[PDB]
Amino acid sequence: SSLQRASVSFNKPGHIPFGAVQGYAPGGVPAYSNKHDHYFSGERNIEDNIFFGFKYQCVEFARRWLLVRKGLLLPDVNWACHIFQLKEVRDAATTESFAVLQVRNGTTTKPEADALLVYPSTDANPVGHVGTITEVGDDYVCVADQNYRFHKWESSCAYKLKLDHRDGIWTIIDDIDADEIEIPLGWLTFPGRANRPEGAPPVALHPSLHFKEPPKPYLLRRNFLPTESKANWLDMNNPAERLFVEEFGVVSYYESNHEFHLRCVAYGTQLHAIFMEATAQVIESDEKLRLFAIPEEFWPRIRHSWKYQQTYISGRFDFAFNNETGEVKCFEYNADSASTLLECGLIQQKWAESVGLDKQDTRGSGFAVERNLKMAWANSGATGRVHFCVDEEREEQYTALYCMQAAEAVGLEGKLCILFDEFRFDDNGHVVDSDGVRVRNVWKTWMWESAITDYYAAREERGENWKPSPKDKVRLCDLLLGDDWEILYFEPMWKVIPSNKAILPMIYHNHPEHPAILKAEYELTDELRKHGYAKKPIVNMIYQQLFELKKQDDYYAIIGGWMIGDAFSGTGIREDKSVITGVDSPFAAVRIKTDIDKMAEDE
Ligand SMILES: [Br-]
Ligand SMILES: [Br-]
Ligand SMILES: [Cl-]
Ligand SMILES: [Cl-]
Ligand SMILES: [Cl-]
Ligand SMILES: [Cl-]
Ligand SMILES: [Cl-]
Numbered sequence: 001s002s003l004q005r006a007s008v009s010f011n012k013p014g015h016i017p018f019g020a021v022q023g024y025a026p027g028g029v030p031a032y033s034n035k036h037d038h039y040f041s042g043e044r045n046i047e048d049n050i051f052f053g054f055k056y057q058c059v060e061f062a063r064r065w066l067l068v069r070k071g072l073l074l075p076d077v078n079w080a081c082h083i084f085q086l087k088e089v090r091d092a093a094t095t096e097s098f099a100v101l102q103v104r105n106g107t108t109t110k111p112e113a114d115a116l117l118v119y120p121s122t123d124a125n126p127v128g129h130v131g132t133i134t135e136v137g138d139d140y141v142c143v144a145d146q147n148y149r150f151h152k153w154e155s156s157c158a159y160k161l162k163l164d165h166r167d168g169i170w171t172i173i174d175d176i177d178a179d180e181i182e183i184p185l186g187w188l189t190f191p192g193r194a195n196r197p198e199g200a201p202p203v204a205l206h207p208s209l210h211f212k213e214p215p216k217p218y219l220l221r222r223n224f225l226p227t228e229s230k231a232n233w234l235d236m237n238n239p240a241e242r243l244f245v246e247e248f249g250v251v252s253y254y255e256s257n258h259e260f261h262l263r264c265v266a267y268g269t270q271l272h273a274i275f276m277e278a279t280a281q282v283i284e285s286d287e288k289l290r291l292f293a294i295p296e297e298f299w300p301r302i303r304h305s306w307k308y309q310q311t312y313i314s315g316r317f318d319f320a321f322n323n324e325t326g327e328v329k330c331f332e333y334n335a336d337s338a339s340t341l342l343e344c345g346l347i348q349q350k351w352a353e354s355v356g357l358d359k360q361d362t363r364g365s366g367f368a369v370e371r372n373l374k375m376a377w378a379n380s381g382a383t384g385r386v387h388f389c390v391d392e393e394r395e396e397q398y399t400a401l402y403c404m405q406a407a408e409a410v411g412l413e414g415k416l417c418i419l420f421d422e423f424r425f426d427d428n429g430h431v432v433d434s435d436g437v438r439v440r441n442v443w444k445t446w447m448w449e450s451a452i453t454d455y456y457a458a459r460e461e462r463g464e465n466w467k468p469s470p471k472d473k474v475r476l477c478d479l480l481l482g483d484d485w486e487i488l489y490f491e492p493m494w495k496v497i498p499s500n501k502a503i504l505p506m507i508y509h510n511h512p513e514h515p516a517i518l519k520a521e522y523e524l525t526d527e528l529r530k531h532g533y534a535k536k537p538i539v540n541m542i543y544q545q546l547f548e549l550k551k552q553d554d555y556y557a558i559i560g561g562w563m564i565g566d567a568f569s570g571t572g573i574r575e576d577k578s579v580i581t582g583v584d585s586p587f588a589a590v591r592i593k594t595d596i597d598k599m600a601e602d603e
Helices: 060-070 079-083 239-247 258-283 286-291 296-308 341-354 367-378 394-409 446-461 476-480 501-510 526-531
Strands: 021-025 030-034 044-047 051-055 087-093 097-098 100-104 115-119 130-136 140-143 159-166 169-173 186-189 217-226 251-257 314-321 326-334 362-364 383-391 413-418 442-443 488-490 533-537 541-546 556-564 567-576 590-593
Touching: 030 060, 044 341, 051 060, 051 130, 060 079, 060 130, 079 115, 079 130, 100 394, 115 413, 239 326, 239 394, 251 258, 258 286, 258 296, 258 314, 258 326, 258 501, 258 556, 258 567, 258 590, 326 501, 341 362, 341 367, 341 394, 341 556, 341 567, 367 394, 367 556, 367 567, 383 394, 394 413, 394 442, 442 476, 446 476, 501 541, 526 541, 567 590
Parallel strands: 251 590, 383 413, 383 442, 442 488
Antiparallel strands: 021 030, 044 051, 087 097, 100 186, 115 130, 115 186, 130 140, 140 159, 159 169, 217 251, 314 326, 314 556, 362 590, 533 541, 556 567
């Protein structure tokens, strides 16, 4: 019991883990959990060179289901909804094309089982959706799919939809969520092909239907000569974009193929899982917590943080990438607070528009950022007012205002706080703001170390019998390390752990397979002496292996990879001919070369 405000996590109640079997469609076709809406793993489902789809999206089910159930291969389709515009599929054995029949919703045709129901594209759901209709009642249809609902099925389908019948017309309506009604376009039948017998084994596919090995990934430094350029290209009204300009006063950017971007989504999301696992191990060990130099006095608190709050908004990986070898290696996870968010999720596209580089065939590397900040916030567990707290530093202010825009977009109320005078103590020692409201949610750039130092400093300046009264000005340590441990902090206190170089030998030991992990040890080893090592200490030592930074046009380049909530949501670059300090280094635009040009990340 004990915990007055609810613990929060991104594992929502109802939902089952990514990849757990939710249930089976008739014929023994399993539906896997995609964790939650709009989650994207970056990982392909391939058995025996048959590319089914992405782990686990809605089309992936459609396609898997069609093979097992009818012996027919659904062709490549970028957006679910485009399925309704298919005229033909293909035969698993002969490859001969095979005529689907398109049957529109809201006509005089009743729907029937073993059809692919297809929802349209909307301003509110841009790729649409595809399910299988497994049964058709008098007044409903049953649907089997992936990536719409996340529960353990209580039957052979995911859900039931209304089937309306008035004046001769049949209309499947999805009004389950009464404030997000959708009407499907219609459904594809496959007239002439019987279901495969139930408990028949799967057909083997003609090898000319094997997945074409994708192109090897590349990230390549390009030079462009803009024909059209815009004098003022940022929106000076928007406060975020203003503080940027007053901070920073034939061109260049990087081009990645779609495969490189997929490789980052997959490596990103997996590294995040790996760091989180590691972070649990540290949290449960007195020894490891002393190693990370967390003072013993803060263990109850950090441990509490870890139990109480399993949500978080941002963290940034630092990668190197080598074009010839294909290798992506991760140096570190700056999960407490990273610069570069506004640049990545806005300024670089804005810029690209200014030099006319947003042609049809490429996209802004951080297109997802905006939409995923909203989803982090919407699912963060924060409710009521959120205080965004920063220093007299513009870089932090535009970082903050950018997450406020996202916060305010999803129903949260926001208040930017520069330093600590917006706050006061009330009659009972609690921290409150200028309108008299008790603090409950705090997003901040202020670092936990800075707080821990201010706490130790504070400890004499007033003493140890001291108890806050309205007389006392609020300090950092009161705003982040006061007696109210149930304030949600964004980036929570446990985020110091995965940010700490001491986690690096632990993630190496737990998962040395991972193509992105670098060998790291607590002690020098003969093998590190051969490969080359860096001796990186902490807040004794850790030793990590070296990776070559390869140059293009003489520039070294480090890649930043954002986690926004649990989404890997984009990449940016900083480059330098000498040393990428990224306090003072030029940021570089990353563009992805790809309705024939749209992706799966949008689902
Ligand atoms: Br609450
Ligand atoms: Br940084
Ligand atoms: Cl897919
Ligand atoms: Cl009605
Ligand atoms: Cl058979
Ligand atoms: Cl403890
Ligand atoms: Cl409130």
